[PDB]
């Protein structure tokens, strides 16, 4: 369907993948906003057009236990690379948990 885990902590996904679906796959919550798909998030974050080859890195939400014995935990980052664009929107994205 929408998401394929291609190697550990890496995925190929469709451009219209629902964000809840992406979150379930990667095991982390993403920032919420005025959008509901992975591409919507990307457009919101870049605030620009998205082109094949563009790489966008988005910080993932901490869980409460990430702060247990650590006042300054290190953010996990999701790297997203736009692999295919059609009609000015991404249709395939590479995701890597860094
Ligand atoms: Br798509
Ligand atoms: Br959207
Ligand atoms: Br960006
Ligand atoms: Br632009
Ligand atoms: Br393009
Ligand atoms: Br927790
Ligand atoms: Br393309
Ligand atoms: Br295009
Ligand atoms: Br990748």
The CATH number of whichever domain residue 71 belongs to comes to: 3.30.465.10
CA 55 – ligand 3 centroid, Å = 7
Name the phi and psi angles at 44, rounded to 5: -60, -45
Resolution (A): 1.8
In whole angstroms, what is the distance from residue 90 CA to residue 62 CA? 27
Cβ neighbours of 4 (radius 10 Å): 11
Containing structural domain, residue 95:
1-98
> By 3-state DSSP, what share of the chain in percent is helix, strand and coil, each rounded to 5?
20, 35, 40
**Strands in the chain per DSSP E:** 3-7, 10-14, 55-59, 77-86, 89-97
CA 3 – ligand 4 centroid, Å = 27
In whole angstroms, what is the distance from residue 79 CA to residue 72 CA? 22
CA 18 – ligand 2 centroid, Å = 8
Of the candidates 10, 36, 37, the one whose C-alpha atom is nearest the C-alpha of residue 25 is: 10
Who's near 74: CB < 8 A, 6+ residues apart?
none
Q: Which ligand is nearest to the CA of 49?
A: 4
CA 22 – ligand 1 centroid, Å = 13
Count how many domains the chain has.
1
């Amino acid at each position: 369907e929408d998401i394929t885990e291609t190697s550990p902590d890496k995925w190929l996904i469709d451009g219209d993948t629902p964000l809840d679906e992406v979150e379930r796959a990667i095991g982390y919550e993403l920032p919420e906003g005025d959008y509901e798909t992975i591409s919507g998030l990307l457009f919101d974050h870049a605030n620009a057009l998205l082109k094949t080859g563009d790489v966008i890195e988005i910080p993932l939400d901490f869980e409460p236990e990430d702060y247990l014995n650590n006042t300054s935990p290190t953010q996990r980052i999701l790297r997203i690379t736009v692999l295919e664009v059609e009609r000015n929107v991404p249709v395939k994205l590479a995701l890597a948990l860094l």
